[PDB]
C-alpha cells in the first residue's frame, strides 16, 4: 500500500516564517531556515514580483522566524533561486543527518503537510513525469517539504509552492529549482500532459509475481528500443538505462528478465486486462517504485 516514512525527524525541523502578515512554513537545519521566497510578497507584488528589488528592501529584522511561539533571531538572509535562506542565531539541536537531492520523475517521497509550522499530516507522493505531484494542500501549506529516509539520513527533495488550476501541485527542490516549467507567480500555469510511469508499472508487476499473481507473464521478449517506441504510443514513459538498472533486484528475485517483463507489459497495453485483476486492481498502478516494492516486501 501507499506508505509514508515516519516523519519525526522532519517534524522537529518545521518552523514558521513571517513577512508582515504572510506566514509560510520553513525548514530549520543547523543554523539556516529554508522557505519559499514568495513570503516577501504582498498582494500587489504577486502578478510578476521583482524578488531582486523586493529582497533589497529587506533587512534581517523584517523576518519573524518562530519555532512554536519562540522567536529565532535572523542574522543573515539571501535568495537562492526560489528559496529564501535565513541564517538564524541558533543551530537546531534536532537537526538530523541530511542531504538535499533533486529527484527524477517517477520517484516517490513522503510529504509532511504543515500549517503555521505545525505538522498536520503525512502521505506518500510520486513526482509525475510532467513534474507535478498529486498532493493534498490547503492555503498555508507552502514551505511543506517532501523527503526520503535512508538509514536515518533524511534526503529532502521537495518544497511546496503551488497548486495548478487542475488541482495538482508544484514546487522546488531545496536549492530553489522548480521541478517543471513553473514560476513562483500568482499565475494560472499549465502542466505538460502527464504520462504513465513505466518503470513503476513494471515494479508493480514484479510485486504481483513475488506474490503469486503471474498469469500476465508471456513467453516473448523485446529490445528496449522497440518497447520504448510502443510505450510512447500508449502515453507511457520510455525506459532509461537507469530504469532497467533499478529493476535489477526485482529481476534477480523473480528470475524474470527486465525485457521479458517489458514484453509482458506491452501485451497488457495492446490487449488490456480481459476482466482480470492484478494484485486486486483492474488498473495498472504506477506510483510504487522498485524501492517501494522491495521496501516491503
Contacts of 61 (CB under 8 A, 6+ apart): 74
Contacts of 271 (CB under 8 A, 6+ apart): none
86 neighbors 32 (Cβ within 8 angstroms): yes
**Catalytic positions:** 38, 142
Q: Which of 13, 14, 15, 24 binds ligand 80I (CB under 6 A)?
A: 24
Size of the site for ligand 80I (CB under 6 A): 21
Q: How far apart are CA 167 and CA 133, in angstroms?
A: 10
- Residue 243 binding partner per list a second copy, ligand 80I, none, with a CB distance cut-off of 5 to 8 Å that depends on partner kind: none
Task: Decide: is 22 part of the binding site for ligand 80I (CB under 6 A).
Answer: yes
Of 165, 199, 206, whose CA–CA distance to 182 is shortest? 165
**Is 229 strand, coil or helix?**
helix
Task: Decide: is 5 part of the binding site for a second copy (CB under 8 A).
Answer: yes
Q: Which of 50, 78, 186, 223 binds ligand 80I (CB under 6 A)?
A: 186
Of 19, 21, 20, 41, whose CA–CA distance to 186 is shortest? 41
Shortest distance in whole angstroms from residue 194 CB to ligand 80I: 17
In the complex with a second copy, which residue's Cβ is closer, 11 or 175? 11
Which triple of cell numbers denotes residue 135? 498532493
Dihedral of CA 254/218/1/180: which sign?
A: positive
Task: Decide: is 7 part of the binding site for a second copy (CB under 8 A).
Answer: yes
Scan residues 87-106 and list those touching ligand 80I (CB under 6 A). Answer: none
Scan residues 137-166 and list those touching ligand 80I (CB under 6 A). Answer: 137-142, 160-163, 165
Residues in a beta bridge with 126: 108
In the complex with a second copy, which residue's Cβ is closer, 54 or 122? 122
Q: Which helix (H) or strand (E) holds 36?
A: strand 32-36
Q: How far apart are CA 214 and CA 289, in angstroms?
A: 19
Which range touches a second copy (CB under 8 A), out of 36-44, 84-92, 122-130, 242-250? 122-130
Shortest distance in whole angstroms from residue 205 CB to a second copy: 17
What residues line the site for ligand 80I (CB under 6 A)?
Answer: 22, 24, 38, 46, 137-142, 160-163, 165, 169, 184-188
What residues line the site for a second copy (CB under 8 A)?
Answer: 1-9, 11-12, 112-113, 119-123, 125, 134-136, 138, 167, 211-212, 281-283, 295-296
Amino acid at each position: 500500500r501507499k506508505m509514508a516514512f515516519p516523519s519525526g525527524k522532519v517534524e522537529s525541523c518545521m518552523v514558521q516564517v513571517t513577512c508582515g502578515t504572510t506566514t509560510l512554513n520553513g525548514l530549520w537545519l543547523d543554523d539556516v531556515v529554508y522557505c519559499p521566497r514568495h513570503v516577501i510578497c504582498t498582494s500587489e507584488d504577486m502578478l510578476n514580483p521583482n524578488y531582486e528589488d523586493l529582497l533589497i528592501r529587506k533587512s534581517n529584522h523584517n523576518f519573524l522566524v518562530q519555532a512554536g511561539n519562540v522567536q529565532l533571531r535572523v542574522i543573515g538572509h539571501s535568495m537562492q533561486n526560489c528559496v529564501l535562506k535565513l541564517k538564524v542565531d541558533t543551530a537546531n539541536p534536532k537537526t538530523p543527518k541530511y542531504k538535499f537531492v533533486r529527484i527524477q520523475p517517477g520517484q516517490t517521497f513522503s510529504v509532511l503537510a504543515c500549517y503555521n509550522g505545525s505538522p498536520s499530516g503525512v502521505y506518500q507522493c510520486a513526482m509525475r513525469p510532467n513534474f507535478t505531484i498529486k498532493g493534498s494542500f490547503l492555503n498555508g501549506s507552502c514551505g511543506s517539504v517532501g523527503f526520503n529516509i535512508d538509514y536515518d539520513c533524511v534526503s529532502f527533495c521537495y518544497m511546496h509552492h503551488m497548486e495548478l488550476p487542475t488541482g495538482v501541485h508544484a514546487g522546488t527542490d531545496l536549492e530553489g529549482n522548480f521541478y517543471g516549467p513553473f514560476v513562483d507567480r500568482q499565475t494560472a500555469q499549465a502542466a505538460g500532459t502527464d504520462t504513465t510511469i513505466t518503470v513503476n508499472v513494471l515494479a508493480w508487476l514484479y510485486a504481483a509475481v513475488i506474490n503469486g499473481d503471474r498469469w500476465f507473464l508471456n513467453r516473448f521478449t523485446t529490445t528496449l528500443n522497440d518497447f520504448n517506441l510502443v510505450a510512447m504510443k500508449y502515453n507511457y514513459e520510455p525506459l532509461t538505462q537507469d530504469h532497467v538498472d533499478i529493476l535489477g533486484p526485482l529481476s534477480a528475485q523473480t528470475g524474470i528478465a527486465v525485457l521479458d517483463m517489458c514484453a509482458s507489459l506491452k501485451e497488457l497495453l495492446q490487449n488490456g486486462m480481459n476482466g482480470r485483476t492484478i494484485l486486486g486492481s483492474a488498473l495498472l498502478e504506477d506510483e510504487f517504485t522498485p524501492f517501494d516494492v522491495v521496501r516491503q516486501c
